[PDB]
XYZ file of N, CA, C and O in Angstrom:
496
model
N -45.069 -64.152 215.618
C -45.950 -63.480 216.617
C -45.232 -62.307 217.282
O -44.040 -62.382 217.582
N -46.078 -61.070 217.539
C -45.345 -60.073 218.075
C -45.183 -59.822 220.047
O -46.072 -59.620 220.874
N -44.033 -59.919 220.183
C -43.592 -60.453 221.784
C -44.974 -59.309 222.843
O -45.773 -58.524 222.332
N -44.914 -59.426 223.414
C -45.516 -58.903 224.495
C -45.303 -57.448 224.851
O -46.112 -56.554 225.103
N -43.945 -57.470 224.798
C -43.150 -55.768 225.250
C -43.085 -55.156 223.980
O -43.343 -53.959 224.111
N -42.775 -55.556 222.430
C -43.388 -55.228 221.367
C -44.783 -54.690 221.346
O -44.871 -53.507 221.018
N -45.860 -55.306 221.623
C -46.881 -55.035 221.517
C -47.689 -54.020 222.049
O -48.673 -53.400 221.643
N -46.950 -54.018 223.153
C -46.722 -52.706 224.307
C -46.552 -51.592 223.741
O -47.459 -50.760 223.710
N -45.544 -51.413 223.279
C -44.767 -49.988 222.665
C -45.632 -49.254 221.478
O -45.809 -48.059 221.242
N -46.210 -50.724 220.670
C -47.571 -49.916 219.650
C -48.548 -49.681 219.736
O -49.057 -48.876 218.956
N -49.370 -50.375 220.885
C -50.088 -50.122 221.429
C -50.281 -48.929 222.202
O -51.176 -48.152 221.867
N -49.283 -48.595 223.566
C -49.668 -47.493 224.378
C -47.840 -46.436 224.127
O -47.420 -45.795 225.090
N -47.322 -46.446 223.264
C -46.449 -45.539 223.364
C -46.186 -43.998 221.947
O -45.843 -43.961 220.766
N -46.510 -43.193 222.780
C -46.547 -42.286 221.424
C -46.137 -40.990 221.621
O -46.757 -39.932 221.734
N -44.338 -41.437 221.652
C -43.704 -39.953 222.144
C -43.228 -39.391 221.357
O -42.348 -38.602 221.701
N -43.497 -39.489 220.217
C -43.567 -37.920 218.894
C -44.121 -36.820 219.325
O -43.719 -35.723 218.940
N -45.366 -36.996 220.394
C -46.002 -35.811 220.512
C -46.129 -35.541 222.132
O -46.389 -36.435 222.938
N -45.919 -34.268 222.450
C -46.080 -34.070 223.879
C -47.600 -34.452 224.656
O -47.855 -34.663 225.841
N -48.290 -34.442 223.686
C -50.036 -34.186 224.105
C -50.980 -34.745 222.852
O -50.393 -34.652 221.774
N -52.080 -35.207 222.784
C -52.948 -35.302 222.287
C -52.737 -34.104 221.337
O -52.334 -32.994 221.686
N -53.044 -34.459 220.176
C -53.201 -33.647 219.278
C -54.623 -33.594 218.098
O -54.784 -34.205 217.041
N -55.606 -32.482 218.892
C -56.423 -32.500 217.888
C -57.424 -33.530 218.660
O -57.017 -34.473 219.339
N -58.913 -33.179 218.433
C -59.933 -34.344 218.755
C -60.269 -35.428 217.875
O -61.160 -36.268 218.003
N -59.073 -35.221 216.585
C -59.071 -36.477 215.677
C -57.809 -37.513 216.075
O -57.554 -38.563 215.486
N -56.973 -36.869 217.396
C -55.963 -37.624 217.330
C -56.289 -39.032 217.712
O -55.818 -40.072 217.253
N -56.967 -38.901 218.417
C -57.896 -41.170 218.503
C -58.101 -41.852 216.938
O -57.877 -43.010 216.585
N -58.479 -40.992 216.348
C -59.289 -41.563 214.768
C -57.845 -42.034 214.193
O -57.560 -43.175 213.831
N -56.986 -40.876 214.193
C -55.748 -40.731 213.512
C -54.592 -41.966 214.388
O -54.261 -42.723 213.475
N -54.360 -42.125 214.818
C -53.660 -42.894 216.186
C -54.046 -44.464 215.974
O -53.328 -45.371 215.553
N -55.399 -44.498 216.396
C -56.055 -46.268 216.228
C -55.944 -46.726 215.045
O -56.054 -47.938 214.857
N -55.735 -45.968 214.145
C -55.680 -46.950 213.086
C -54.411 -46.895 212.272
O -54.168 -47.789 211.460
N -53.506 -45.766 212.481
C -52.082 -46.042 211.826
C -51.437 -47.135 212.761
O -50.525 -47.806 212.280
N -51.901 -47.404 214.264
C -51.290 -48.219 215.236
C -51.742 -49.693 214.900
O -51.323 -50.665 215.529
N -52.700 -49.779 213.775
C -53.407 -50.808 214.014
C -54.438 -51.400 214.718
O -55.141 -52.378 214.464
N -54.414 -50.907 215.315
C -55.886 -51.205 216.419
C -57.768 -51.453 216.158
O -58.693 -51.937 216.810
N -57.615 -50.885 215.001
C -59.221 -50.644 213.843
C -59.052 -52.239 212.552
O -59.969 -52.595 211.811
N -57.653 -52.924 212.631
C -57.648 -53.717 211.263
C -58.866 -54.342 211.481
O -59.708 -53.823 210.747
N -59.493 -55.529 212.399
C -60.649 -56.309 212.047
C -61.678 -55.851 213.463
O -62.617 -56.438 214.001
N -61.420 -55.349 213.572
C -62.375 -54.679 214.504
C -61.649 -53.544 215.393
O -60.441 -53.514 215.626
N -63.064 -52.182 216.057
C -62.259 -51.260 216.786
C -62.041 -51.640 217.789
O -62.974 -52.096 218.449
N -60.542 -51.608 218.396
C -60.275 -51.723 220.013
C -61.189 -50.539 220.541
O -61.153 -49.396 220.085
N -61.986 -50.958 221.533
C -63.301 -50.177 222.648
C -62.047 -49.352 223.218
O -61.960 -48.260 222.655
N -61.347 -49.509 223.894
C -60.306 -48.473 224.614
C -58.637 -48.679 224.628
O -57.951 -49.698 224.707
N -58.324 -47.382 224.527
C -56.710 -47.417 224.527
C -56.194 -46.619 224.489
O -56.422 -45.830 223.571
N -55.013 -46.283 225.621
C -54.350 -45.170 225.942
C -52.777 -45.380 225.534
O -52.058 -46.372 225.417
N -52.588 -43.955 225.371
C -51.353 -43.632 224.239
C -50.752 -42.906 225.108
O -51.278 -41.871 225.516
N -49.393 -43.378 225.596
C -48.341 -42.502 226.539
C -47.102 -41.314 226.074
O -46.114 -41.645 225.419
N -47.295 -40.247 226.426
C -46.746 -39.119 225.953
C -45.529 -38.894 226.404
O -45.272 -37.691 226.371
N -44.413 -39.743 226.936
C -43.260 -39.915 227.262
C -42.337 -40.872 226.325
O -42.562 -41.638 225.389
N -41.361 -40.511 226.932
C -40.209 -41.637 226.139
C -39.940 -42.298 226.684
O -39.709 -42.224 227.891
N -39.850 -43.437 225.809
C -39.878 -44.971 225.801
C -39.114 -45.616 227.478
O -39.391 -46.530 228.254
N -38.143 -44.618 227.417
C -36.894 -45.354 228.817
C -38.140 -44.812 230.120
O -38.434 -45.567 231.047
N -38.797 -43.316 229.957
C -39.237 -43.149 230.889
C -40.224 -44.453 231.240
O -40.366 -44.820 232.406
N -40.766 -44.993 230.336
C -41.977 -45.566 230.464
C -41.531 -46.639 231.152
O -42.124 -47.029 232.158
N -40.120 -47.401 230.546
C -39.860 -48.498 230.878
C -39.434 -48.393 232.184
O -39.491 -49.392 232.901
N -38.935 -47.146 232.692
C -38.280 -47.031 234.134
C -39.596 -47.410 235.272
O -39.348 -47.748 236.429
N -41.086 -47.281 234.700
C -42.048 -47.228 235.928
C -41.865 -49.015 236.583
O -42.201 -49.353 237.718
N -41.316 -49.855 235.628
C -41.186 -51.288 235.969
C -40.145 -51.460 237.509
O -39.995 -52.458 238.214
N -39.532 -50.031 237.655
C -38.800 -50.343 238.573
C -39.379 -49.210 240.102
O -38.944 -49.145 241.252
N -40.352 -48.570 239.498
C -41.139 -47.556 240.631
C -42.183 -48.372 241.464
O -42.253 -49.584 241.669
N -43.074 -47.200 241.935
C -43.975 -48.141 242.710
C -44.597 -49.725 242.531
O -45.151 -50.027 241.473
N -44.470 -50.671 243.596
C -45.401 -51.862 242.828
C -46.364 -51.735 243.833
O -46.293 -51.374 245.007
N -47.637 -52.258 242.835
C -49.128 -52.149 243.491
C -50.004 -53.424 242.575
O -49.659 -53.724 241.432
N -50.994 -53.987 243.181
C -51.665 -54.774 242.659
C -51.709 -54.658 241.188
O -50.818 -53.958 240.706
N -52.584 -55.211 240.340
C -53.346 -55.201 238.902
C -54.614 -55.568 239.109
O -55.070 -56.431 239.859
N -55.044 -54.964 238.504
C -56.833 -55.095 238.639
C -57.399 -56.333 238.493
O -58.508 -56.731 238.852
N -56.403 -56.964 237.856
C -56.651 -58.466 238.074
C -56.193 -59.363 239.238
O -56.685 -60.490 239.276
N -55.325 -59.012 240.180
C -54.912 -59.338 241.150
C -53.736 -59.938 240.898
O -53.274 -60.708 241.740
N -52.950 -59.643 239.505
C -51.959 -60.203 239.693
C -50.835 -58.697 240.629
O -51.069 -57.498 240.786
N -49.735 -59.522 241.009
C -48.730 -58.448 241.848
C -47.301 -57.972 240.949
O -46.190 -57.777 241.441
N -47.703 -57.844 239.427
C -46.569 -57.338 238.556
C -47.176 -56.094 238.121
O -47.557 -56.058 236.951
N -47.350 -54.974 238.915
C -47.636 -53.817 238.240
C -47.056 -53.175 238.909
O -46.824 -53.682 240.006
N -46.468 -51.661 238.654
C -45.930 -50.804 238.819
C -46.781 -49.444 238.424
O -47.425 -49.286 237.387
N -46.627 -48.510 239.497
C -47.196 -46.982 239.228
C -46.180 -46.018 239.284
O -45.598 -45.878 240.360
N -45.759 -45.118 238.032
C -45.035 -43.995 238.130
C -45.517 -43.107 239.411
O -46.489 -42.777 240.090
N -43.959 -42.953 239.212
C -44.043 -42.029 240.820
C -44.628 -40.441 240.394
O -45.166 -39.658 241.177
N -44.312 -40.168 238.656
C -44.960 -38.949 238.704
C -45.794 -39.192 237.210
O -45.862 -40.208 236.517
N -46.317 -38.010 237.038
C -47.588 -38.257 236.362
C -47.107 -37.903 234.677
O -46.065 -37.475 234.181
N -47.986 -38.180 234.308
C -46.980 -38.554 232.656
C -48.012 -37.976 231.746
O -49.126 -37.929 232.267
N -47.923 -37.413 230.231
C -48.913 -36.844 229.131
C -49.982 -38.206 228.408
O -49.485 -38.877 227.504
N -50.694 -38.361 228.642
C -51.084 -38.849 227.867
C -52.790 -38.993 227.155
O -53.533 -38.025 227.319
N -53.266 -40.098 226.467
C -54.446 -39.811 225.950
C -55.398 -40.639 225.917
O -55.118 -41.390 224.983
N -56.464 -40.998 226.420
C -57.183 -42.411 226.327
C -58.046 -42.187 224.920
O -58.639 -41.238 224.407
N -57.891 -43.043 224.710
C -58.967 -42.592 223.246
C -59.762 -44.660 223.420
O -59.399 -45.828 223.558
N -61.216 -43.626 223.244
C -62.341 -44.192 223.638
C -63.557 -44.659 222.146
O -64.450 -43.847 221.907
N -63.508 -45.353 221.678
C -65.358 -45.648 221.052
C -65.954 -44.800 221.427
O -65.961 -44.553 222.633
N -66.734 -43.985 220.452
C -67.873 -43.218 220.950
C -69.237 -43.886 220.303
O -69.315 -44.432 219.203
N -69.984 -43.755 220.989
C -71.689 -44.910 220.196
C -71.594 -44.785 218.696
O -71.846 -45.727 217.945
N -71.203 -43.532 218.267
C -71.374 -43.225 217.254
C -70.440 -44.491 216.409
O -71.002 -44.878 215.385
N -69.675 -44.877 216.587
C -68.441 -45.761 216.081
C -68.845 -46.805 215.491
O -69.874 -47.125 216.086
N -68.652 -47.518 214.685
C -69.369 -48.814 213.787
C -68.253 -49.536 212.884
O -67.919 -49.013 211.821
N -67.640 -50.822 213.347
C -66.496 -51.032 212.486
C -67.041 -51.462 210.788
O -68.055 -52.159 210.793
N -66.479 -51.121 209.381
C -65.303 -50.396 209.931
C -64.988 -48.918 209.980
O -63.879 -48.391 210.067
N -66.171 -48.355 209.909
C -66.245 -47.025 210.279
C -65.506 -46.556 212.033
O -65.440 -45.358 212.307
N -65.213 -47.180 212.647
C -64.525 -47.159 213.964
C -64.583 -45.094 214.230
O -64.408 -44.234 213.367
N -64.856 -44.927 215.555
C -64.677 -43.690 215.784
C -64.365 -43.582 217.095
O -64.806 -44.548 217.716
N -63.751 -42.758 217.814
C -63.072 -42.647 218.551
C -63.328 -40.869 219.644
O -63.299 -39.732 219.174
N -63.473 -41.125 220.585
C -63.112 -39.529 221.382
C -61.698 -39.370 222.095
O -61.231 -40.291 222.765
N -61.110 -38.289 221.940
C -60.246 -38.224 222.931
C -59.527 -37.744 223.485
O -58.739 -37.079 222.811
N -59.351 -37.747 224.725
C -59.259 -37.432 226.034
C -57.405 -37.345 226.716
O -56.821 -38.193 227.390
N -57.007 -36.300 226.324
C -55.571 -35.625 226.990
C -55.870 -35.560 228.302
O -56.944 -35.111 228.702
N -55.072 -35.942 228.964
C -54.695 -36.034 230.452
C -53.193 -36.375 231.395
O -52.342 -37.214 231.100
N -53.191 -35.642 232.339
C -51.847 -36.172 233.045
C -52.033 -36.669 234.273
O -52.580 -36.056 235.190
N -51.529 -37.936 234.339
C -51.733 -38.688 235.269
C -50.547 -40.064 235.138
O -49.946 -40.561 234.186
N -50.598 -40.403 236.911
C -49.953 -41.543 236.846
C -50.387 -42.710 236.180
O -51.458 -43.095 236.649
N -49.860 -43.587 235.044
C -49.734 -44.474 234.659
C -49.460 -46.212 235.763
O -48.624 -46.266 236.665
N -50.326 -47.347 235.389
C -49.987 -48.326 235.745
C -49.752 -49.371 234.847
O -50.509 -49.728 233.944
N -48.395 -49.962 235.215
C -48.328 -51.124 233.905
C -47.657 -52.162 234.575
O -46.972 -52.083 235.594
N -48.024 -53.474 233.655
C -47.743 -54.846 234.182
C -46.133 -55.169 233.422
O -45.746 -55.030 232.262
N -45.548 -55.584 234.491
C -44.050 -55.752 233.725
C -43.266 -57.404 234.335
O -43.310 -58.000 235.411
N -42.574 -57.683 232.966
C -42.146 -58.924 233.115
C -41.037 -59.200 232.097
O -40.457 -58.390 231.374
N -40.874 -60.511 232.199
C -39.337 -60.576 231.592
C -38.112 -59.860 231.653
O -38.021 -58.928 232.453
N -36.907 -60.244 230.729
C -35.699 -60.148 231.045
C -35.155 -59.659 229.922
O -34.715 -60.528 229.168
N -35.006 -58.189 229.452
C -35.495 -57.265 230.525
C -36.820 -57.470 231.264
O -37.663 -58.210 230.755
N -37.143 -56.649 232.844
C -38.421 -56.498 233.179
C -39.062 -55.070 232.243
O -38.485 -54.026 232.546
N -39.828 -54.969 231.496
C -40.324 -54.201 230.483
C -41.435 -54.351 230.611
O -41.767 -55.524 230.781
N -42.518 -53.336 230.600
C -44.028 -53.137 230.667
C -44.886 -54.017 228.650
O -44.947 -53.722 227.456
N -45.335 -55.182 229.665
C -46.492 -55.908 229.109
C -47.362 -55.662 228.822
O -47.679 -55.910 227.658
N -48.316 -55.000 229.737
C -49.627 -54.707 229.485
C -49.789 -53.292 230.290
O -49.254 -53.147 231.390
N -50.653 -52.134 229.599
C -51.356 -50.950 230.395
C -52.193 -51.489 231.356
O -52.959 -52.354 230.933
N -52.293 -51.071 233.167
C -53.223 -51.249 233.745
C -54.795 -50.254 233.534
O -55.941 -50.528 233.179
N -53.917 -48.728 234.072
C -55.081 -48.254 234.106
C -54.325 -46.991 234.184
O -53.131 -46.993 233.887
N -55.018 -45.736 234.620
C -53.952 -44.255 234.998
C -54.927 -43.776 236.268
O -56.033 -44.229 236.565
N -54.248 -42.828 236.854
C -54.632 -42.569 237.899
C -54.017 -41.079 238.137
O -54.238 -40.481 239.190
């Protein structure tokens, strides 16, 4: 099984590129990441920093989780990245995707030993 902070890094980390690249970069992205194998993930954002930056937000601001748990952390500054979204049009396994470059603060849930980001909250 793939650990948690693993899952993390393929999921929301993608610092080859400074920015979104291209309005195919969702199409292109979700599915070399895996995310399209048995169905499309509805949403998921791809962080345009490197890896240490990302991991450093575990030690920046802490603020709730939308779930109410109290292991999240918000970068203190705002970071590249891309949400890539389902568009209606999308039908697995045709999966399709829009998406959306933006800079903004990042929130992520962090745990273990190391403390290392688990799960994306949200961006802001």
């Amino acid at each position: 099984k793939e650990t948690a902070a693993a899952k993390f890094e393929r999921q929301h980390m993608d610092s080859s590129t400074s920015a979104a690249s291209s309005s195919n970069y969702c199409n292109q992205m979700m599915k070399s990441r895996n995310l399209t194998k048995d169905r499309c993930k509805p949403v998921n954002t791809f962080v345009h920093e490197s890896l240490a930056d990302v991991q450093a937000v575990c030690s920046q601001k802490n603020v709730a989780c939308k779930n109410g748990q109290t292991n999240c952390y918000q970068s203190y500054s705002t970071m590249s990245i891309t949400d890539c979204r389902e568009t209606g049009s999308s039908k697995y396994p045709n999966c399709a995707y829009k998406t959306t470059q933006a800079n903004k603060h990042i929130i992520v849930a962090c745990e273990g030993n190391p403390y290392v980001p688990v799960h994306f909250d949200a961006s802001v």
